[PDB]
Design a protein around this ligand. Structure first.
Ligand SMILES: O=P(O)(O)OC[C@H]1O[C@H](O)[C@H](O)[C@@H](O)[C@@H]1O
Ligand SMILES: O=P(O)(O)OC[C@H]1O[C@H](O)[C@H](O)[C@@H](O)[C@@H]1O
Lengths: 170, 294, 294, 171
């Protein structure tokens, strides 16, 4: 059912967001000793980021940007504008501050319920801005108007922001 | 009407050439994908009347446990193929040469030296390397023979298996190494190059102790109503223009002297690959080797 | 709670700015898009209780036929706006400077010279140029005023209209010119640049006989229950930071003295555009001018 | 509103678009043989004819006229033609050389509207089940459509210009 899938995805997203915050807090002291102009410290940072990526169910892409680096696991250069921006952090490294952005392209559960159940997913803020979609009739950055559509839908609020996850079936 | 093909190959390698055969001969080709031994075992239990026509991919000349499921055939194109890699198996025609490789994640590697199987046993790599099931896959099985060929020690095979994570699918190894779940993995050349060419941080390593070369084969499947064009397909797959296209568009290594062996960009041709010589290759039959390393 | 905005602007220009006001002031903004005079006429027949709050876009200081549908208000930042273009209309606040332009398809132009309104009357261009309905749009109406201002001849207006194809929507002109349906068209600066920046073969021409400059305005709509943040919205749209963002991100021309222009490329700055001087502008009121050229 | 009605309407629209291309190529055989595409005036004259052809039909079409020194196209946004339906390919004799003309269809209003309003998607496949057009993200142009694998409400018809089938379907 849509209701069962809405609960599962919200719990999975809330867990994933807690692990990211726990990761950043527990690596605060470690990152301040790593200078990202050194090839060893870049490798050590990539190892920690990729380890974090594969501890979560969702398909996540990180972007660590600064003066000398644009470090990412988006090796195929997929358009991050079509992804859910999930967290943004300014991290203190030995040599400079670095911005860490984590994007969610999908989750295995949302992709499966789209394939097997034709249930699509939207993430919108309190002003109806579309922040995530896996249905091509919706574009991230545009407005969601629920009165324009008649699909069975159920929504739940995400904990990390004033965002709503909407799972629907046409 | 439909010509059904069993193949462990990835679709990206064989679907284009088979599509050209479809247009050339006005026939529909359907592919059944899966691990080599899973396809063979399901073929064995498949009812005689519903079986497909052709099996392509895998080391068929050495890992077909049920020869009664296939029909002998001789490709008229053998005289143009490399003499070291022709089939002595009554049911199999040699098709491609596929080096088995170690894939290394260059984002994770750092200073960890990885040049062969022995380097994979470094304690820092424990639980961070992957391989596919040797009982069901060509790739996992051939790698276990390569590890055994080092010192002819079953302990070396067991030592690696206790050091690595076994996966069910060969292509899951390259995907999870490329995406950063594992530091290294046991794969094969064409799969490794597919993900390296997409931009993933994949380094292809030919084991310094001896690289196992796969002689991929083609076999006709014993069925009630063989497709009338299947022998033409075997000739097509071993034909010069098709082997040349496989080398040019897909960087494969041809079975034929005739095709010009264009090796550059990424990674080696045959001469520069430290292949396991014919004297060090284990001659233990497929099933017996699998039980021995059990 | 919802603040409704009437606007002939394209969504790509005002939706981002209004989205930021939504987040800052905790209000949802709904936009009604449409031709300027169509929005004004529907607003006029809309009952007092159901009307929106703010009208932004179009030459409101000169084409509002029903001033009783609006509330007198004046932005406190008027003293920081360019003196030539401040509002003389109690109901309107100046917002942006928008030059009207001729758009030319450079793939179709060839050797055909198109430098102004006179070049458009070449027999080679008959039926191959487009414009929007002057009765319903700001752009079509302002262009007819510019054509009339050349020699103060209604025959010049009629000569062009019999030479061009009239479209219902202003933005349809730039789309069909950019896509190659028409050799040229009558558009405005921001719409022309939207399609030129996407790669379309669009040349922006400021008519040499005199370019009509639109002073876009903002007006409060007279309704039963005005939204408590609508005057704050007017302050926001005329603030320096927002005007600076409009020039930086969308190449717009600001109404404020403090904010600097940004043309560099494409073209032009305001000083280098052959604008119709304020003394040559026809002083015939909107409705009366439209009926005169009917 | 039905799939049946939309397949008939889309098939008629596609046939009309293709017939304009065929009539254009037939009627412009001798005209192009007098045009040298190394002359910029003849390039302009060719672009004028191509853009005029585009706007005589409803579908969103992109042309590619390629040869020595030239790659002439109206794909100004550089959209990926591999995600478009290859609709016709012609070798044209110009004064100085032969030039290949390809016409791609990115979409048509009939297919785009029924996708938005009715959630009815469109596939174009050849006789070997190769996907030649799709507006559904679960199908990729160049891959195989396997009918036996889906439960869709669908209706199919053959297009006149090739051994292609238009399939309109709904979940
Ligand atoms: O999944 P598998 O059984 O490992 O088969 C996948 C591939 O691996 C082997 O290395 C063979 O060289 C290929 O012919 C085969 O297609
Ligand atoms: O469709 P219209 O009524 O012509 O309005 C669309 C645009 O055209 C004019 O040129 C104005 O400068 C703009 O403020 C207006 O948004």
């Amino acid at each position: 059912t849509i209701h069962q899938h809405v609960d599962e995805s919200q719990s999975s997203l809330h867990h994933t967001e807690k692990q990211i915050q726990t990761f950043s807090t527990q690596h605060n002291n470690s990152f301040q000793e790593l200078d990202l102009t050194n090839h060893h410290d870049v490798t050590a940072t990539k190892r920690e980021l990729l380890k974090l990526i594969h501890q979560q169910p969702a398909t996540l892409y990180y972007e660590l940007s600064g003066p000398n680096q644009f470090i990412t696991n988006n090796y195929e250069h997929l358009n991050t504008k079509n992804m859910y921006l999930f967290s943004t952090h300014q991290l203190k490294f030995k040599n400079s501050t670095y911005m860490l952005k984590i994007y969610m392209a999908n989750t295995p559960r949302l992709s499966e319920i789209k394939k097997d159940n034709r249930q699509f997913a939207l993430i919108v803020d309190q002003y109806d801005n579309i922040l995530y979609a896996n249905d091509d009739r919706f574009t991230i950055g545009e407005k969601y108007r629920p009165q324009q559509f008649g699909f069975m839908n159920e929504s739940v609020k995400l904990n990390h922001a004033d965002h709503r996850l909407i799972i629907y079936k046409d | 009407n439909v010509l059904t093909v069993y193949s462990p190959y990835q679709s990206n390698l064989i679907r284009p050439i088979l599509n050209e055969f479809e247009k050339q001969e006005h026939v529909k080709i359907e592919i059944k994908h899966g691990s080599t031994q899973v396809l063979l075992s399901n073929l064995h239990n498949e009812d005689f009347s519903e079986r497909g026509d052709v099996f392509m991919g895998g080391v068929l000349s050495e890992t077909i446990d049920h020869p009664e499921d296939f029909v002998p055939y001789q490709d008229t194109s053998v005289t143009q193929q490399l003499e070291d890699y022709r089939s002595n198996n009554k049911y199999v025609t040699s098709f491609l040469l596929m080096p088995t490789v170690i894939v290394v994640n260059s984002d994770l590697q750092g200073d960890i030296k990885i040049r062969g199987y022995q380097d994979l046993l470094q304690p820092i790599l424990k639980g961070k390397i992957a391989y596919s099931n040797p009982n069901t896959t060509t790739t996992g099985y051939q790698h276990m023979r390569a590890i055994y060929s080092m010192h002819h020690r079953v302990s070396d095979v067991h030592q690696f298996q206790n050091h690595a994570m076994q996966l069910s699918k060969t292509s899951k190894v390259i995907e999870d190494v490329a995406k950063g779940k594992y530091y290294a993995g046991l794969s094969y050349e064409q799969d490794a190059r597919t993900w390296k060419n997409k931009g993933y941080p994949v380094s292809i390593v030919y084991p310094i102790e001896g690289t196992m070369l796969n002689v991929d084969g083609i076999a006709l499947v014993k069925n009630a109503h063989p497709h009338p064009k299947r022998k033409k397909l075997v000739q097509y797959l071993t034909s010069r223009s098709v082997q040349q296209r496989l080398v040019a568009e897909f960087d494969a290594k041809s079975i034929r002297k005739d095709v010009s062996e264009q090796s550059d960009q990424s990674i080696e041709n045959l001469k520069n690959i430290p292949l396991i010589p014919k004297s060090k290759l284990p001659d233990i039959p497929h099933h017996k080797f699998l039980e021995m390393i059990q």
